[PDB]
Scaffold this active site. Structure first.
Site, short mmCIF file in Angstrom:
data_model
loop_
_atom_site.label_atom_id
_atom_site.label_comp_id
_atom_site.label_asym_id
_atom_site.label_seq_id
_atom_site.Cartn_x
_atom_site.Cartn_y
_atom_site.Cartn_z
N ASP A 136 0.73 -1.36 -0.03
CA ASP A 136 0.13 0.10 0.03
C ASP A 136 0.75 1.21 0.02
O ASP A 136 0.70 2.06 -0.79
CB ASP A 136 -0.88 -0.19 1.05
CG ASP A 136 -2.31 0.56 0.78
OD1 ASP A 136 -2.58 1.19 -0.39
OD2 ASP A 136 -3.28 0.52 1.68
N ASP A 154 -1.78 -0.93 7.60
CA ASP A 154 -1.69 -2.39 6.61
C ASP A 154 -2.94 -2.86 6.23
O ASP A 154 -3.70 -4.08 6.59
CB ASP A 154 -0.95 -3.35 7.90
CG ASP A 154 -0.56 -4.55 7.52
OD1 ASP A 154 -0.41 -4.67 6.19
OD2 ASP A 154 -0.48 -5.52 8.31
#
Ligand SMILES: *CCC(=O)Nc1cccc(Nc2nc(Nc3ccc(N4CCN(C(C)=O)CC4)cc3OC)ncc2C(F)(F)F)c1
Length: 271
Positions: A136, A154
């Site tokens: 990400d 996360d």
């Protein structure tokens, strides 16, 4: 099985703190089972994923997230299974570091900026150590607990079960390869974002063009506050050779070092 199963009644939703493609987040409160303590939480309510296959996939990732235990990684407190899947997260009072830097450019001092890179790189290494690829990493996926303390969000693994080309390693773009080393390239783009006090990387340039640009050896420009030991670390993260890139353990040391004499490495506006 460190993942708490929460009862819908243990918590209340105060305000919508935006809504993405993945789900909807709320500032809320959570009174744990048989406790007279009131925890401020973020409630990630999930989208259209009601298929028995999908819910098992969600839960399985939910356990993985719930076992990620590190000061610079946003903790998953529990899950609430009802009509919808709700992910009860730790509330980050100052929103995302990207918004924060775009709102504090003037007062953001060298000592903070350098200690945020150590903080991110610390959390990142924990994932490389647990052999979990973040996928990400952007300044938008780093949240602010205290202006001294940041945490990484996360969701890269969960989001998998709308392309971030401008944060991706060339292997991720052209061969769909995601290693803890492509996580290093994204990390470079994120550290560039903080040094530019939240600028748009490769702004105005179309996504399709970006691959060939990087192939022509072109990279992100040198940010005015950056020295040379600094802007170098940034280009080492953007090496076409995925293994020529620094490791997250290395990045920690060369920033931990750097944080001991901040203004030496960053030219702010004093001091
Ligand atoms: C820059 C990227 C971004 O906006 N990330 C973001 C937005 C909303 C909700 C989350 N999840 C989340 N959030 C917190 N704390 C938090 C987050 C954001 C705010 N902002 C959002 C922008 N804004 C608006 C639309 O009015 C101003 C306020 C505030 C805030 O703290 C109260 N903590 C945890 C999570 C998590 F669920 F993702 F873990 C991220």
């Amino acid at each position: 099985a460190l993942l708490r199963i929460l009862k819908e009644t243990e918590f209340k939703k105060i305000k919508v703190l935006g809504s993405g493609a993945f789900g909807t987040v709320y500032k809320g409160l959570w009174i744990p089972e048989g406790e007279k303590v009131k925890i401020p939480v973020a409630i990630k309510e999930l989208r259209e994923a009601t298929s028995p296959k999908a819910n098992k996939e969600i839960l399985d990732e939910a356990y993985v997230m719930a076992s990620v235990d590190n000061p610079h990684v946003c903790r998953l407190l529990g899950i609430c299974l009802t009509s919808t899947v709700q992910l009860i997260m730790q509330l980050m009072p100052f929103g995302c570091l990207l918004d924060y830097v775009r709102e504090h450019k003037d007062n953001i001092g060298s000592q903070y900026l350098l200690n945020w890179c150590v903080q991110i790189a610390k959390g990142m290494n924990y994932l490389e150590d647990r052999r979990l690829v973040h996928r990400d990493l952007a300044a938008r996926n780093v949240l602010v607990k205290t202006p001294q303390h940041v945490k990484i969000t996360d969701f890269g693994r969960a989001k998998l079960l709308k392309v971030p080309i401008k944060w991706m390693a060339l292997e991720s773009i052209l061969h769909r390869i995601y290693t803890h080393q492509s996580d290093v390239w994204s990390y470079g783009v994120t550290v560039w974002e903080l040094m530019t006090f939240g600028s748009k990387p490769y702004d105005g340039i179309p996504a399709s063009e970006i691959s060939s640009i990087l192939e022509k050896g072109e990279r992100l420009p040198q940010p005015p506050i950056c020295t040379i030991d600094v802007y170098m670390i940034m280009r080492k993260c953007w090496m076409i050779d995925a293994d020529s890139r620094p490791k997250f353990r290395e990045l920690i040391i060369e920033f931990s070092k750097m944080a001991r004499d901040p203004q030496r490495y960053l030219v702010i506006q004093g001091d």
